[PDB]
Amino acid sequence: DDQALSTIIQLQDCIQQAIQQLNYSTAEFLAELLYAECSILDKSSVYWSDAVYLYALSLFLNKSYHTAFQISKEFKEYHLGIAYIFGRCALQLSQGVNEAILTLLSIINVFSMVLNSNLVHIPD
Amino acid sequence: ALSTIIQLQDCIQQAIQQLNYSTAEFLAELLYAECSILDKSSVYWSDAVYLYALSLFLNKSYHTAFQISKEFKEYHLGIAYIFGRCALQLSQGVNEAILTLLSIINVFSSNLNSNLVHIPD
């Protein structure tokens, strides 16, 4: 447990590093492994939501828009970035726009769960 | 009038950092047009060309950024990187990318510091 948190932080840092350059397949593999590792952690942990959001962003980035769209629909409410990924997938695919609206309206009205984070591509 | 171009290039940095595409399309076009006239060898010229090529690359516009980076690949390392990856995507102009990047690596080998976004190490 003492090193368990360090590994997750290191994997997250590597994922932001990889996505910072135009290196996506490695970002895919690191996001996949972090998402698999975070399975044991409870859903209440911010780490699970962060890993799911990173995985969704990656799966969006490599044109695998369908898979990103499901992996965003399962936990769309938990994180703001997941909702962003869901909305992007919906606009590209014209599938399930309505729940995207129902989530985005709530998230914007409340702003003006997890809402703010230091990760990359966190929407403003 | 360099404050305005510095501000708009920072805006381009922020926009691309926000995963918005076709947003820095116009802004990079504007920087290219504005800075093509003031100089052809200044650091701002290479910076504008690199940002323009990166914006063109990211927006499924490869047959333009290809030649755009081809013209000025020898000036900035990021331009050469964009040129090489576009060569890979389009399967064209590959030998030129090989020579330019070999020259770049040899510079590191022999006894460049721009910190712009998406610049590979």
From Swiss-Prot, chain A:
In terms of superkingdom, the source organism counts as Eukaryota
Location(s), subcellular:
Cytoplasm; Nucleus
Mod. after translation? Phosphorylated by CDC28, which is required for the early mitotic activity of the APC/C in its CDC20-bound form.
Family the entry assigns: Belongs to the APC3/CDC27 family.
Describe the protein's quaternary organization and the partners it interacts with: The APC/C is composed of at least 13 subunits that stay tightly associated throughout the cell cycle: APC1, APC2, APC4, APC5, APC9, APC11, CDC16, CDC23, CDC26, CDC27, DOC1, MND2 and SWM1.
The further comment given in this record reads: Present with 593 molecules/cell in log phase SD medium.
What does this gene product do? Component of the anaphase promoting complex/cyclosome (APC/C), a cell cycle-regulated E3 ubiquitin-protein ligase complex that controls progression through mitosis and the G1 phase of the cell cycle. The APC/C is thought to confer substrate specificity and, in the presence of ubiquitin-conjugating E2 enzymes, it catalyzes the formation of protein-ubiquitin conjugates that are subsequently degraded by the 26S proteasome.
Name of the molecule in the record: Anaphase-promoting complex subunit CDC27
* Originating organism: Saccharomyces cerevisiae (strain ATCC 204508 / S288c) (Baker's yeast)
Full protein segment contained here: 20 to 152 of 758
